[PDB]
């Protein structure tokens, strides 16, 4: 293979990328992260939500117009009871909530939001384009989509939230999964623009402007 | 009528973990360009510089215990040590205990040398083999 010199060549070449990246970082290399996101790395079991409530009330008049969820249902394996127990009720007072329900937990999710005081009103459908179908092995029917359950509480009569703006159906590719479609945040914009948002169990991919993001991998 | 820039910064300070945001409130992109729990704190940067002074270069098992109590990858250490000495081959320096005072001197000597030699890439001197 004549491959001692080979291996010595990949090493000196690889180190210069490190010596390059760390210097650009020192020179202000930007992140993909937008500059207005508020990432928080915590464990929702160990996190104190009064700190988030005090701080948001403090620097904002308001509370959250939208909440997004993608719970780590155990089938990162968070106890079912534990998720139900998060004080979501206190995090938001008037507005919408979004939560992604895998087929296994669709009924449980509905029970969950209803428990937290929301009224189920709508569901987003995300089909997974081959690029145009999705093959997933259902127990009873194959799965070509996951769904976003939408609950509402309070006065949305305000112009703050705009009705009849957005779709039920999203058509994105199965980017990098487990990863949701970006055009969720586009839809949330349409539904309520320039608003205070919250995402729980977020990942670095999720971070967007205006969004408070909580996830243990941030 | 709300400024989300300020809002983020204020929120970020109270809520955001230390390494996420700067002391002024804004978020530091250094954190987000390094995966997971791999970001390199300026506080353990002085720890590598302190271990080269006490134990010497290539002593990483020796220096791993003291200043990086369990894990930093020893590949990383030798990679940052060639950052400290301004050279991409750190072979020459191995086993020598080098003061922070010296390290700084070596770095400005290898960098000026490589710039005259025109063998400087990314503020690191490229050593021939
Ligand atoms: C369904 S995934 C997130 C996928 C996300 N919807 C997306 O858009 O990619 C599960 C997420 O829950 C987070 N998570 C798991 N256990 C957690 C815990 N105890 N506290 C906070 N976050 C947790 C993990 O970081 C993981 O990112």
UniProtKB/TrEMBL annotation, chain A:
S-adenosyl-L-methionine 2 binds at residues 43-44, 180, 203, 205-206, 216-217. The keyword Transferase applies. Keywords: Methyltransferase, S-adenosyl-L-methionine, Transferase. GO terms for molecular function: mRNA m(6)A methyltransferase activity. S-adenosyl-L-homocysteine 1 binds at residues 43-44, 180, 205-206, 216. S-adenosyl-L-homocysteine 3 binds at residues 43, 178, 216-217. One of its GO terms (cellular component) is RNA N6-methyladenosine methyltransferase complex. S-adenosyl-L-methionine 3 binds at residues 43-44, 217. One of its GO terms (biological process) is methylation. S-adenosyl-L-homocysteine 2 binds at residues 43-44, 180, 203, 205-206, 216-217. Its EC number is 2.1.1.348. Transmembrane segments: none annotated. It catalyses: an adenosine in mRNA + S-adenosyl-L-methionine = an N(6)-methyladenosine in mRNA + S-adenosyl-L-homocysteine + H(+). S-adenosyl-L-methionine 1 binds at residues 43-44, 216-217. It is an enzyme of class 2 (transferase). S-adenosyl-L-homocysteine 4 binds at residues 206, 216. Belongs to the MT-A70-like family. This is mRNA m(6)A methyltransferase. It comes from Tetrahymena thermophila (strain SB210). The chain holds residues 196 to 428 of 428 of the full protein.
UniProtKB/TrEMBL annotation, chain B:
This is Transmembrane protein, putative. It comes from Tetrahymena thermophila (strain SB210). The chain holds residues 164 to 292 of 295 of the full protein.
